[PDB]
């Protein structure tokens, strides 16, 4: 089977992970299931009779993504040393974060349109491999008209022909989750551009 | 016996691929081809597609939890050769996982309210309320945070309850706009506003 479990559970009762149902299981009370791992007794808790496993705390995926997982009368082991995947599933709950709070850049005065100024980057602590939670899109908030930024790549280019020293510009770039669709989390950075003479 | 796997998918999937939902499976299966899995119920056959050989369920459409949060389907497992069940036909649930795609909406659009003129600081005026269609079970996509956008020095709002209070110690009408926003303490998310009129008694 597969044992996922949604992160950041906000409620007050235990979280059902799933049950270990052996093909060796007879049907009656012939067997009992045993815990195997770190947290397996307080964090994860097992129903001895059935193999039902439940979690006991609210879990943050970003803090730990993955977890490592006999007869009632005799105790004779009919199963091998167990190990399953308890991978905490992902929700979008981390803001995109730029790699630098202030990017300092310069661009030649007599510059053609599309002239590279500086490239900005935002990491995203969420799962880039499930949903759009970490698909970040870059947009310009201040400095607009004079400069452009590539939605996907975060490359800032000059977007104006007639540009001579106003020597200085302050550009604000937004990064946003969910391929930029409304509802996504966002971060900003400021870019100080001086025109080189 | 049916293996008690879970069945889910994210809402509002923006990819031309079909989403994997889960695997129906039983003890009696032998990785053999001897079993035929059958899927019936609301959606089966067009909304939800099953591999009869492995028991893999896929979803075809982009779904919306706020429209419909859980689906009840029926699972069967029959012998190919004999045509007989190896498992009893059972209902099972497909859960639709949430994305933050609903704004907090205030109960009223205009909250007309009143409070005495000579009132002390922190005198309760009115409690505004916003609700959020998203899922309160996981994260903050549906936990709203109240904040004041207009009505400064004059008035205050309680962050988690939406109670408006007098913020002064010393005009008759006051236009106060309260904002509600999910994903508190985080930039982004979704927000809603409301106008609250305050007239002082004289
Ligand atoms: Ca988290
Ligand atoms: Ca994110
Ligand atoms: Ca996360
Ligand atoms: Ca929705
Ligand atoms: Ca939603
Ligand atoms: Ca929401």
Automatic annotation (TrEMBL), chain A:
Localization per Swiss-Prot or TrEMBL? Cell membrane
List residues of the Cadherin domain.
22-98, 99-197
What superkingdom heads the lineage?
A: Eukaryota
State the protein's purpose: Cadherins are calcium-dependent cell adhesion proteins. They preferentially interact with themselves in a homophilic manner in connecting cells; cadherins may thus contribute to the sorting of heterogeneous cell types.
The protein in question is named: Cadherin-6
Q: Which organism is it from?
A: Mus musculus (Mouse)
Segment of the intact protein contained: 58 to 260 of 790
């Amino acid at each position: 089977n597969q044992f996922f479990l949604l992160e950041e559970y906000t409620g007050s009762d235990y979280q059902y992970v799933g049950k270990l149902h052996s093909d060796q299981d007879r049907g009656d009370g012939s067997l009992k299931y045993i815990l195997s791992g770190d947290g397996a007794g307080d964090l994860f808790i097992i129903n001895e009779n059935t193999g039902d496993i439940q979690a006991t705390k609210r879990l943050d995926r970003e803090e730990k993504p993955v977890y490592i997982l006999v007869n009632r009368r005799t105790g004779r082991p009919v199963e091998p040393e167990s190990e399953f995947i308890i991978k905490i599933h992902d929700i979008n709950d981390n803001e995109p974060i730029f790699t630098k709070d202030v990017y300092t850049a310069t661009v030649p005065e007599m510059a053609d349109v599309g002239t590279f100024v500086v490239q900005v980057t935002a990491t995203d602590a969420d799962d880039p491999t499930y949903g759009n939670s970490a698909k970040v899109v870059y947009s310009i908030l201040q400095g607009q008209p004079y400069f452009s930024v590539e939605s996907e790549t975060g490359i800032i280019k000059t977007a104006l022909l007639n540009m001579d020293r106003r020597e200085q510009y302050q550009v604000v770039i937004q990064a946003k989750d969910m391929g930029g669709q409304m509802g996504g989390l966002s971060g900003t950075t400021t870019v100080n551009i001086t025109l080189t003479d």
